[PDB]
């Protein structure tokens, strides 16, 4: 037969049941498929179908082909070529039969696979369950069944949503068409009763839409008659009615995905574009004759048995991710461009280009590049599915659940991304500008220019001059803000005037409550003074020279008064609540004088002004005189109150955004929700990522190399007591730093109420 709607494996080995379409009708049919396998030796043997072969391995090779029955009846049942005899290891043996068929047959295809080779218009059914509320529907019936106000709200909510979605329904009415009755319910026997009644009304010629993100999928297949062809999918009844009326657009989108990807409708998942990318990449890899590292059973890339073992390169590859993000703090009287960036992963994969043993295979990378060029061209021609694919590639290169996931691939892509971000910085600086900040999503650039109204032409020139270089052909360079004047120490602690004044300071959050308003007020005064001085200098014509003189004496008067008030009231139960220093994530250190903490913060912000250090320094002295603190006393030195706890490369799937998020320096809204869209993140997912980071650091401590404490050589041997240069061995990750990391983890867990991470921390000790 010459078109497919579903594959699924029979109970017996090597046999598929298949659902095919011809002459209008769906038909059930059955295919017999061999298991292709590769084996490797460093000696010849050929006792037995077996064939000598050649194909690139992942970083003497024979192809082998059996029906799965005899393979199973030999491999773990008989002394055979599958046992010992210098096998360096099987490779593709994990690929399930239907997952082989989906690659080599597609949709545009008992019956032997040896002779098989490479307008929907039918009925739909529906079963979405919202855990008690198993909900049922047919595209050829007039009532909806729900398991255990109801009727009234259902009828009018249907009418309302139907009115809201008339054209959207009508344009897909022929796929799925509308008013209906309803009924609301040991009770799980009804599900088998309903599904059997459906089968009796339609033995074939109808398609079943299963479930939605509150999944119970496997138990669903237990209650459901397993023999249907099924599209698997992963007073608040508005949700349900909206899904019902969404159905036709879903079928349209799925048909578009299938017709593009050449994948049957039942097998692909809307929930993971990574799987579509997997099957398509697998097709091109085998068509370019690469031995395929597809893994069905585990995340790890199936290199044969060797992926079971620990390896120091592999563990470094898996553990490591952090960009060498640049942060040049200072005051900037120049205009600063807030350059947003996107498509850096896509751009670098496109613009990319043993002796090297953790590089991903150059052949497979070439296939990924050429295939991404193919997808990109089809996105330029507005294949919406191809654009959705290219946007989703950043997930697939990182997602361990991808069938062709490889740690070396993730790392090869990652460090290429790093190198290209540095080359982008090199280009911007080569154009005479200077970089305030840079990471994988953003660059802030000093312009060597003084007014935004002069620069709206020059900025677009600059951005175009970058993107016209071939190295950056595909970047989404976007001037997201214009800063007239910028005070900057990190991306959680800055203020400036934009073209209108904004101020955000994690520094502020660690001051006691009575002084937090005071800090903001003086920040506005400092910005106003810097502005007045900038424009004053520009009317006379580093422009900041003398800006302290517009407010210094008022500031010292104010601080004398506040010091008197603190001596009056810090002890007082009437006022002590506003002098309590807050407990916070990454709360670095203790402090005994909160006014001194405010003054330290204000002086530190002003000491960012590289041109003017002397006037701020003298003002800092005369302020610290108020406390009888010496100018260089360690009590008066500024150390950042926030200890960063960054989770690298966190993914917002709703907009495919790859952000490092800092649980201490970020504001809580930027932790619990995205910062390009504003969808919220799942709490258990987030705790899981923190546990992955915690265990990554414990492992990274335990697997570390030791280093000689005076000549800094690495300890190359297993049983020396000290280095041959007489120096003792010391860790490259000293224990103190790891205790500090665990301390910030316990603080973060206590504050945000992360129960699972807290249990993990507790189970380390106890």
């Amino acid at each position: 037969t010459w078109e497919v709607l579903q594959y699924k494996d029979s109970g017996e080995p090597g046999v598929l049941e298949v659902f095919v379409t011809i002459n209008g009708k769906v038909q059930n049919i059955t295919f017999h498929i061999p298991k292709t396998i590769y084996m490797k030796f460093k000696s010849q043997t050929m006792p037995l179908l077996i064939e000598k072969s050649s194909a690139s391995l992942p970083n003497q090779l024979f192809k082998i082909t059996l029906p799965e029955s005899v393979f199973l009846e030999e491999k773990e049942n008989c002394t055979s070529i599958f046992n010992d005899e210098n096998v360096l290891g099987v490779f593709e043996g994990t690929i399930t039969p239907h997952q082989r068929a989906i690659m080599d047959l597609g949709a545009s295809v008992g019956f032997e696979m040896k002779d098989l080779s490479m307008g929907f218009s039918m009925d739909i059914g529906y079963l979405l369950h919202f855990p008690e509320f198993f909900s049922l529907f047919k595209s050829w019936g007039d009532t909806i069944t729900i398991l255990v106000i109801n009727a009234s709200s259902l009828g009018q909510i249907y009418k309302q949503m139907f009115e809201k979605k008339k054209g959207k329904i009508e344009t897909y009415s022929y796929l799925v068409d509308i008013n209906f009755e309803f009924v609301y319910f040991k009770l799980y026997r009804r599900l088998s009763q309903e599904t059997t009644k459906l089968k009796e009304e339609r033995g074939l010629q109808f398609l079943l839409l299963l479930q939605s993100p509150f999944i119970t999928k496997l138990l669903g297949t237990i209650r459901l008659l397993n023999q249907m062809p099924i599209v698997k999918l992963s007073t608040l009844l508005k949700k349900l009615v909206n899904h019902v009326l969404s159905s036709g657009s879903w079928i349209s989108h799925l048909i578009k995905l299938s017709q593009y990807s050449n994948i049957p409708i039942c097998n692909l998942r809307l929930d993971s574009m990574d799987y579509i990318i997997d099957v398509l990449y697998a097709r091109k890899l085998k068509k370019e004759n690469i031995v395929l590292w597809w893994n069905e059973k585990a995340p790890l890339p199936d290199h044969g048995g060797i992926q079971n073992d620990f390896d120091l390169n592999t563990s470094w590859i898996m553990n490591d991710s952090e960009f060498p993000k640049i942060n040049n703090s200072g005051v900037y009287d120049n205009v600063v461009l807030d350059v947003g960036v996107d498509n850096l992963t896509v751009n670098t994969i496109l613009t990319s280009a043993e002796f090297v043993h953790d590089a991903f295979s150059n052949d497979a990378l070439n296939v990924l590049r050429g295939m991404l060029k193919e997808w990109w061209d089809e996105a330029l021609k507005e294949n919406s599915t191809a654009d959705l694919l290219v946007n989703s590639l950043a997930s697939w290169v990182q997602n361990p659940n991808a069938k062709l996931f490889d740690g070396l691939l993730r790392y090869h892509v990652h460090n290429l991304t790093k190198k290209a971000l540095l080359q982008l910085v090199n280009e911007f600086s080569a154009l005479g500008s200077t970089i305030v900040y840079a990471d994988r999503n953003q660059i802030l650039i000093k312009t060597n220019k003084y007014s935004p109204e002069n620069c709206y032409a020059y900025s677009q020139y600059m951005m175009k001059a970058v993107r016209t270089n071939p190295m950056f052909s595909y970047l989404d360079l976007n001037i997201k803000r214009y800063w007239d004047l910028l005070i900057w120490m990190d991306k959680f602690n800055f203020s400036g005037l934009a073209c209108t004044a904004v101020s955000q300071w994690q520094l502020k959050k660690f001051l006691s409550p009575i002084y937090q308003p005071e800090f903001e007020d003086w920040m506005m005064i400092i910005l106003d003074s810097m502005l007045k001085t900038k424009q004053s200098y520009l009317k006379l014509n580093n422009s900041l020279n003398g800006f302290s003189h517009l407010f210094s004496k008022p500031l010292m008067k104010r601080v004398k008064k506040l010091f008197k008030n603190q001596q009056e009231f810090i002890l007082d139960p009437q006022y002590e609540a506003d002098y309590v220093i807050p407990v916070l994530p990454g709360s670095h250190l203790n402090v005994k004088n909160p006014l001194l903490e405010l003054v330290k913060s204000l002086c530190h912000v002003m000491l960012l002004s590289k041109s003017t250090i002397l006037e701020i320094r003298t003002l800092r002295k005369e302020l610290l005189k108020i406390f009888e603190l010496r100018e260089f006393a360690k009590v008066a030195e500024f150390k950042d109150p926030s200890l960063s706890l960054v989770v690298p490369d966190f993914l917002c799937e709703y907009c495919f955004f790859i952000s490092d998020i800092d649980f201490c320096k970020a504001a809580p809204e930027s932790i619990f929700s995205c910062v390009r869209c504003h969808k919220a993140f799942n709490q258990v997912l987030l705790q899981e990522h923190l546990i992955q980071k915690l265990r990554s650091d414990i492992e990274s401590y335990l697997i570390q190399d030791l280093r000689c404490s005076r000549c800094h050589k690495v300890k190359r041997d297993y049983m020396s007591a000290h280095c041959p240069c007489a120096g003792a061995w010391e860790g490259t990750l000293p224990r103190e730093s790891i205790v500090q990391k665990l301390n910030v983890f316990k603080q973060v867990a206590k504050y945000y109420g992360f129960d699972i991470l807290l249990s993990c921390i507790a189970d380390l000790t106890i």
């Binding site: 773990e76 046992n83 390896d311 120091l312 492992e699 335990l702 697997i703």
Partner: protein
């Protein structure tokens, strides 16, 4: 038989080597404090050396009785092992499924 020879090679390696992980830490990292728990120096009286990739067995070597119950579900049979401490017998057991 190949199975006997390889399992004898396994247990004889482990007990002569006296230590459950003879491999370098670069091939199997150990928490440095707890390496004393992998060592066997007064050889145990019995060892349930469960290994997913060898035949079931109940060898004796230097008086140490070493039993591998193997994979739970193998060749359409569920498998489990009944060690009798007061006689050191080892009755293997199975269920077809």
């Amino acid at each position: 038989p190949q199975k006997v020879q390889e399992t004898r090679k396994l247990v004889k390696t482990i007990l002569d080597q006296g230590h459950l992980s003879p491999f370098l830490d670069s091939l199997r990292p150990i928490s440095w404090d707890l390496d004393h728990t992998l060592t066997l120096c007064p050889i145990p009286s019995t060892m349930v050396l469960c290994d997913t990739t060898s035949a079931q067995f109940d060898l004796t070597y230097n008086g140490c009785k070493v039993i591998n119950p193997g994979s739970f579900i193998h060749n359409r049979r569920a498998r489990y092992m009944e060690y009798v401490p007061s006689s050191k017998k080892t009755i293997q057991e199975e269920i077809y499924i």
